[PDB]
Amino acid sequence: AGRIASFLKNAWAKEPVLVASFAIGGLAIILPSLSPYTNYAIRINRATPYNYPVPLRDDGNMPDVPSHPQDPQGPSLEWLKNL
Amino acid sequence: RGEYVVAKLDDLVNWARRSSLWPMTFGLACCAVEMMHMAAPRYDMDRFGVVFRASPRQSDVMIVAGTLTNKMAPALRKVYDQMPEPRYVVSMGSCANGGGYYHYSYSVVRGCDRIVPVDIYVPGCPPTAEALLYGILQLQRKIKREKRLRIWYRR
Amino acid sequence: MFMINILSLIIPILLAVAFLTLVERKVLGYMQLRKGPNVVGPYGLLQPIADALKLVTKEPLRPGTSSISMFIIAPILGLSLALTMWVPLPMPYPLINMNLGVLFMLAMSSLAVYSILWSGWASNSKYALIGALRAVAQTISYEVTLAIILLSVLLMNGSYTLSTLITTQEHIWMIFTSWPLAMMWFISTLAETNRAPFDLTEGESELVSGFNVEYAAGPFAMFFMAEYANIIMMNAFTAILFLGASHDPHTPELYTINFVLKTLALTITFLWIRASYPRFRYDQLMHLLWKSFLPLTLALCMWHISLPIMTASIPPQS
Amino acid sequence: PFFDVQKRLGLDLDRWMTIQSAEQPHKIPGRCHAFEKEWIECAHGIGGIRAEKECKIEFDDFVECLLRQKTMKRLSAIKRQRDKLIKEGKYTPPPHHLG
Amino acid sequence: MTMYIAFILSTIFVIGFVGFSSKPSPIYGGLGLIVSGGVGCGIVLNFGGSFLGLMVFLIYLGGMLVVFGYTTAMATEMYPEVWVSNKTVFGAFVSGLMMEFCMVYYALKEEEVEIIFKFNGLGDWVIYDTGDSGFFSEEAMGIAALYSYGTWLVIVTGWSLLIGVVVIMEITRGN
Amino acid sequence: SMMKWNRERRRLQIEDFEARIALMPLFQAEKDRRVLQMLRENLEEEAIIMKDVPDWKVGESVFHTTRWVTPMMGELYGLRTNEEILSATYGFIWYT
Amino acid sequence: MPLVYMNIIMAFAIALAGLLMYRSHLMSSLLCLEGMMLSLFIMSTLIILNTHFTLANMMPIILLVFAACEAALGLSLLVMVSNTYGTDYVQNLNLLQC
Amino acid sequence: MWFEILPGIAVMAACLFIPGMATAHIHKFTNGGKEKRVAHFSYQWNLMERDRCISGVNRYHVTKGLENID
Amino acid sequence: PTKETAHWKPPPWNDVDPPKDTLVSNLTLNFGPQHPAAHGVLRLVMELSGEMVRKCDPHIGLLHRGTEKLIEYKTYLQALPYFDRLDYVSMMCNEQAYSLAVEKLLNIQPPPRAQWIRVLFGEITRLLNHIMAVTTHALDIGAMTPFFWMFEEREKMFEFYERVSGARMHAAYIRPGGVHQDLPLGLLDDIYEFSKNFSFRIDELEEMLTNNRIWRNRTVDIGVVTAEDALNYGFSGVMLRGSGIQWDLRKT
Amino acid sequence: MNIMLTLLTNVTLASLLVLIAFWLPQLNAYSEKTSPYECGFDPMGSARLPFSMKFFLVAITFLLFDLEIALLLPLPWASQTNNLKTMLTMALFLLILLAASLAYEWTQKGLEWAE
Numbered sequence A: 001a002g003r004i005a006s007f008l009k010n011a012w013a014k015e016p017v018l019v020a021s022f023a024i025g026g027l028a029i030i031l032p033s034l035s036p037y038t039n040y041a042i043r044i045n046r047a048t049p050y051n052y053p054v055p056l057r058d059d060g061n062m063p064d065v066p067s068h069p070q071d072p073q074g075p076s077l078e079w080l081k082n083l
Numbered sequence B: 001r002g003e004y005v006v007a008k009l010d011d012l013v014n015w016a017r018r019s020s021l022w023p024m025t026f027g028l029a030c031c032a033v034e035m036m037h038m039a040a041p042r043y044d045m046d047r048f049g050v051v052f053r054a055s056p057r058q059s060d061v062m063i064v065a066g067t068l069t070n071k072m073a074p075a076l077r078k079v080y081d082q083m084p085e086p087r088y089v090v091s092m093g094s095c096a097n098g099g100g101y102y103h104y105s106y107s108v109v110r111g112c113d114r115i116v117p118v119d120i121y122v123p124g125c126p127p128t129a130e131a132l133l134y135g136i137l138q139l140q141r142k143i144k145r146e147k148r149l150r151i152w153y154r155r
Numbered sequence C: 001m002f003m004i005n006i007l008s009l010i011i012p013i014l015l016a017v018a019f020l021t022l023v024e025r026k027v028l029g030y031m032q033l034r035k036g037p038n039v040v041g042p043y044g045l046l047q048p049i050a051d052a053l054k055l056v057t058k059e060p061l062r063p064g065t066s067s068i069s070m071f072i073i074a075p076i077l078g079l080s081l082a083l084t085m086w087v088p089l090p091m092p093y094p095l096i097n098m099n100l101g102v103l104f105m106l107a108m109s110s111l112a113v114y115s116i117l118w119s120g121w122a123s124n125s126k127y128a129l130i131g132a133l134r135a136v137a138q139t140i141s142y143e144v145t146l147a148i149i150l151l152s153v154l155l156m157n158g159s160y161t162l163s164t165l166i167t168t169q170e171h172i173w174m175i176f177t178s179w180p181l182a183m184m185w186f187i188s189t190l191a192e193t194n195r196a197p198f199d200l201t202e203g204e205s206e207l208v209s210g211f212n213v214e215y216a217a218g219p220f221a222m223f224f225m226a227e228y229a230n231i232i233m234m235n236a237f238t239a240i241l242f243l244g245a246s247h248d249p250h251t252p253e254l255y256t257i258n259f260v261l262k263t264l265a266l267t268i269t270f271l272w273i274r275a276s277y278p279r280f281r282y283d284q285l286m287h288l289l290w291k292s293f294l295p296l297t298l299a300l301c302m303w304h305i306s307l308p309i310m311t312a313s314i315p316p317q318s
Numbered sequence D: 001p002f003f004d005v006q007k008r009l010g011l012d013l014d015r016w017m018t019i020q021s022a023e024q025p026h027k028i029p030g031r032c033h034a035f036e037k038e039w040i041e042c043a044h045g046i047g048g049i050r051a052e053k054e055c056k057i058e059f060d061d062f063v064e065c066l067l068r069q070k071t072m073k074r075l076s077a078i079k080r081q082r083d084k085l086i087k088e089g090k091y092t093p094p095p096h097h098l099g
Numbered sequence E: 001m002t003m004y005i006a007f008i009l010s011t012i013f014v015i016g017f018v019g020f021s022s023k024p025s026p027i028y029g030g031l032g033l034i035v036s037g038g039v040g041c042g043i044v045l046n047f048g049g050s051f052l053g054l055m056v057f058l059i060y061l062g063g064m065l066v067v068f069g070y071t072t073a074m075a076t077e078m079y080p081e082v083w084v085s086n087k088t089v090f091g092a093f094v095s096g097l098m099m100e101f102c103m104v105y106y107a108l109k110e111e112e113v114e115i116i117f118k119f120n121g122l123g124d125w126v127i128y129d130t131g132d133s134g135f136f137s138e139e140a141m142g143i144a145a146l147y148s149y150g151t152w153l154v155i156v157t158g159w160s161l162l163i164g165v166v167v168i169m170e171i172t173r174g175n
Numbered sequence F: 001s002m003m004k005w006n007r008e009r010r011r012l013q014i015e016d017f018e019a020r021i022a023l024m025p026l027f028q029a030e031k032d033r034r035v036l037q038m039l040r041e042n043l044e045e046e047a048i049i050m051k052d053v054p055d056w057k058v059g060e061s062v063f064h065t066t067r068w069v070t071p072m073m074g075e076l077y078g079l080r081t082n083e084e085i086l087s088a089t090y091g092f093i094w095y096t
Numbered sequence G: 001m002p003l004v005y006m007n008i009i010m011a012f013a014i015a016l017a018g019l020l021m022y023r024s025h026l027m028s029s030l031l032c033l034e035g036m037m038l039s040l041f042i043m044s045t046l047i048i049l050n051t052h053f054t055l056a057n058m059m060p061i062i063l064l065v066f067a068a069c070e071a072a073l074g075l076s077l078l079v080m081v082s083n084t085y086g087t088d089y090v091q092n093l094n095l096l097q098c
Numbered sequence H: 001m002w003f004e005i006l007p008g009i010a011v012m013a014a015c016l017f018i019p020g021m022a023t024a025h026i027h028k029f030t031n032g033g034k035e036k037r038v039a040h041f042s043y044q045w046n047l048m049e050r051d052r053c054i055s056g057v058n059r060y061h062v063t064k065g066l067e068n069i070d
Numbered sequence I: 001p002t003k004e005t006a007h008w009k010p011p012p013w014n015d016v017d018p019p020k021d022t023l024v025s026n027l028t029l030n031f032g033p034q035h036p037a038a039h040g041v042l043r044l045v046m047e048l049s050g051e052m053v054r055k056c057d058p059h060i061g062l063l064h065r066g067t068e069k070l071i072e073y074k075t076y077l078q079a080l081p082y083f084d085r086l087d088y089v090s091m092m093c094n095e096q097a098y099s100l101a102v103e104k105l106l107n108i109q110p111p112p113r114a115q116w117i118r119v120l121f122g123e124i125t126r127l128l129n130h131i132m133a134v135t136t137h138a139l140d141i142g143a144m145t146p147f148f149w150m151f152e153e154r155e156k157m158f159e160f161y162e163r164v165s166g167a168r169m170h171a172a173y174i175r176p177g178g179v180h181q182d183l184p185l186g187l188l189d190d191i192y193e194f195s196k197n198f199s200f201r202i203d204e205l206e207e208m209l210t211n212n213r214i215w216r217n218r219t220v221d222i223g224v225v226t227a228e229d230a231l232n233y234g235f236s237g238v239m240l241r242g243s244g245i246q247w248d249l250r251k252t
Numbered sequence J: 001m002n003i004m005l006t007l008l009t010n011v012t013l014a015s016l017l018v019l020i021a022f023w024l025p026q027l028n029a030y031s032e033k034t035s036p037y038e039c040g041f042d043p044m045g046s047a048r049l050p051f052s053m054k055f056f057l058v059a060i061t062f063l064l065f066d067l068e069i070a071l072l073l074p075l076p077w078a079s080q081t082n083n084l085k086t087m088l089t090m091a092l093f094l095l096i097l098l099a100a101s102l103a104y105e106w107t108q109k110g111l112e113w114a115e
């Protein structure tokens, strides 16, 4: 209680650089897990098509895959536009 | 004929030397403090291209500032002997010029000339800063009247 | 006309370095109540010419206790690396679009040790042999901090393409995002160029000069040219890295003017710092970075690598 | 390996990189992905001292894809004969070979 | 003709190595290594290895810096050796020059040099591969995969560097 | 500010890429024809080259597999002009 | 196998000779030793860039990181024989005899 | 009297000024008024090579639109 | 063993060989003699295990003039300027010391105005000499600006020195039996203006040096001198006052 | 070509400067100039003796940190990966190991410049 607070105060006075570094570091690990946008960053990275989306051979009974690149169905990234 | 070109070229060279002489400080006594006053704001040696600070390897002029004792003499000799050409040595102060107050001492040489060639004799005890500065200007005019390549061409 | 562009890069940098030797003697003097050089031409404009001519026609003394090979090679390395390290700079259109320009230039920045060591040892003097190791330790121990600072800053840029750095800043000055980092970076820059607060190699009481002791005239002036070219080059690096500017592609001159103004301001800050501060001690000099700078730099790098992930704001790779 | 903990306790530790037909970053195939796929799927559950002879033609096709020893030697022979007869001067390369 | 540069980059690599290994003064071996590394950075670079070339540039021109750092500290003496001091070093150097010269002369005549393995003297420009890269450098992306697929590699390395600083502590501790 | 600007830059990159995917098929369709043109030109020319040599089976494939491989760039830019091969290999590396 | 492979392999062979055939210096020998790994580093990067071995692109730096560590201790050992013995000249390096 | 420094850096500014437009203008001079087409990836290099081939003058920065085709 | 095995001495039982020739050395440094960072003349033959200095050995005599031999050939009136040229940053203080000795021998006291002029100009000398010490110290440490900023004021002091005696440095002013001659008219007013203006630059120097991080760090708590060990060593002046002994000849 | 042309231009330019520097001026070439220098004296019998030192440890920990700096260099490319979570944890491991090596260097004297 008192000892911990006094030690924090002394560190903030004796080696201020050490406490600043330790603090900002300790944040650096625990925020990314807590933050609700890292999944959105994963979505950012998966969104970028570095290579060609090679099509699939059509044979019937794939309603999920759009027939045309202008078709409504299929993966969409309107969240990317709003972001 | 060749005098025109060689004179213009060597005039350029001696001007460049004249406006960029670099003192090798070397203050031994109160003459050092007066020289330091001469580099102070008021007179501002550094304005004329003189730089005051200079290692003995990169320097053009030695100011023998103060009394030169017997124990000092070998050190001053080794300093000047290492000084690159051109090397004009100015002696400031009655003590360095010859003898001084302590002329008839037992461990003080009776003049920097007996140790090292002196190019400009600056008198004063101490020579008031502007008198030193005037000696520097006299050395500058001496560098102006320099005919190295003329004598080479007319050897 | 490529070689013409090269020459238009070297030669103006040479005049810039030349007149830096005048602007420093004027700025310092005015900072300490001295008028500065104003006798050689108007306002001392011609003074750098005279000293350059003197040093060219000053006798270059051969160090008798030396192997001339390194006594000649070290100025070559120091000067040539300093100039070729200007090659990939983002002027509105950088001369050489090297995909790893920042890493390219950081790697070449480490090469100044390869002039310092040969100068300090080949000249074969006590001051030289001391100052060689001391300055080498300085610059190598600050190169690491330069490296992590560069990486942490770049983690928000996107890549090592140094032309896209402008595209990174565009809206806001990058210092607004990494002012704690830049404050270290700038200072480490001050350390790497061996300037009065952090020089430690001159030390005109116990090292006198450190590396440029026995060097005289021309090879001696070449190391000054390297030193006062690294000033401009690293101040320009910091200028683009943190002090961004506008660049309209239809008007390239605008970014050029803004960038040169930033470089001049930063160099004036260099002269400003040196004209005031005392000089570090080797003990404190390495205490400053090992004990204090490095942990903060590590923590800041951790912060600046975690930050783009949590904000879902990773910079574009291409 | 001597004590293969990798497949016993069930994880890859180094097998991801061992060969170049594995899942490369962003599907960047190797130079000889087809040949080494052929070789690997040829020699699977067969035994090294038995598979080295059945999967031979695949193996040297793989090695020639890696090094191009035979193909570059063929090119060297072609260049040799071309320069020889050009120096001794019979025909001229067609304009596609000049510009 | 700057065609053969991709060849000569290796060639200056060889004879800068021999003098580096000619057992001269330690700094002259260092100079040989320095020119060898500088010319080998071009060898990796013109093959497309921009990042790896600049990487070896940086780390290696720091690494020879530190091996210098003790050469003037724990390796100098009253009379440092010179690249012309010992007589045998010249013989080592010239034996360095004539071997690969004879072999390349053969590879220029027969193109089937029999030394050790099988080699062809028909330059190096052939062995490159046609293709593309889209909008990503293969080398950079591969070295970036260290933090996604290099699961074990970074772990074992970082552990080794920690153990390395520990042993560097302990051996030089001086009781 | 950097968060929003970097999101916009990601938007620009996906747009530029989408252009790249849009135009990739045409570049592929010109490239295979161009490479096959080099191969056929080299084959016809080398056929005349190899008539005199007693043992050189024309157009042979060193590979036992019948599957087509990407031409090794050597036979691509073979007897071609030295500048053509110099560009084809070291242009990207040498370009600034 | 083109001439670049010959050159770096041949450079490694003479590095083997130079380090292993000691002349009189320990520091220069470990210098030859670290040049050895430079030759191997270049050699390794060659095939890896050549064959589009995308993963193996990280092997050189990995190969690098350990190798300097060796030199990191090598020269570190060099000082420890040096302060007592005086030099790195390995001909006094004889105390351990029997 | 700080303005005495103003000439001193002014030429200095000009000294750093020249590398700015000189590289900027020459690029614009060389590439038909367009700025240099930076090729940071092999796709850019392939585009530049196809532009050079299509130009027919071995000059990539020469560009022809639909008027060149049917 | 056959033959050469004879020259194969058994190893010791500790497994440590008898420590070889003593290489312990501290690499003597001469640290001079020109070395203009000593006011120009000095020699320090230093013995150091690298950094921590083990044992120094200053060599004074590098500016040796036979002044103490020179005095007993001139009269006291002729002997006065030696003291002026003796400690050339505190001229009038040395002249005060010598003159006070002389007319202490003579059982003579200077007139009161002579005493007041003496103390006023001795204090101006004190200002000059302290400016010397602090500014040149900052120059050694690295600070260049406080040198010139206070040296302009030192020149202003030199103007007063010139206006009273006749030379800006070596006054020969304070003679036995009172000062040589009266001050010029208007000198007091100029002294008044300078004194008004001086504190605003004294504090200005303070702010640059006092609270600065690196001025303190290079200087704070380096080379402590014990108060007891200070006075036995013959230390005096601020050297004593720095340690803590309340002693000052001006008061006691 | 281009880049190599710039490197060639710079090295030749530098060599012309050093050639004019070392050849143009004239020297009388007298013996006593060769005497070496130390603040007025010569460096007695030193300036090549083995340098009994202590900051060797700082010099070597430089290199040991430089390897890890090389290891963490690929980060800007690495941040462009699909599995960002693993990259985050493992890069954080690398910087934590940096800090731990520095801390062990710290408490166990180490980076403390030896006396």
Ligand SMILES: COC1=C(OC)C(=O)C(C/C=C(\C)CC/C=C(/C)CC/C=C(/C)CC/C=C(\C)CC/C=C(/C)CC/C=C(\C)CC/C=C(\C)CC/C=C(\C)CC/C=C(/C)CCC=C(C)C)=C(C)C1=O
Residues within 6 Å of the ligand: B025, B036, B039, B046, B051, B052, B053, B054, B058, C011, C014, C015, C017, C018, C019, C021, C024, C025, C028, C029, C048, C049, C051, C052, C055, C202, C204, C212, C221, C224, I036, I037, I038, I039, I136, I137, I139, I140
């Ligand atoms: C009482 O106690 C005391 C002490 O202790 C106890 C002391 O200690 C001291 C000692 C203190 C001092 C000496 C104080 C010095 C004070 C001064 C006012 C003098 C110094 C003044 C300055 C403004 C400082 C200047 C120093 C700087 C900036 C840096 C210092 C460090 C260096 C390494 C510099 C050393 C000098 C060098 C290198 C020489 C300079 C060379 C050049 C400028 C070369 C220029 C070349 C060119 C321009 C080339 C290009 C030319 C052209 C024409 C371009 C075009 C050409 C083409 C080919 C294109 C004292 C006095 C003291 O009282």
Ligand code: SF4
Residues within 6 Å of the ligand: B029, B030, B031, B065, B066, B067, B092, B093, B094, B095, B096, B100, B101, B124, B125, B126, B127, I085
């Ligand atoms: S001449 Fe006068 S001021 Fe100069 S040193 Fe001698 S006594 Fe002192």
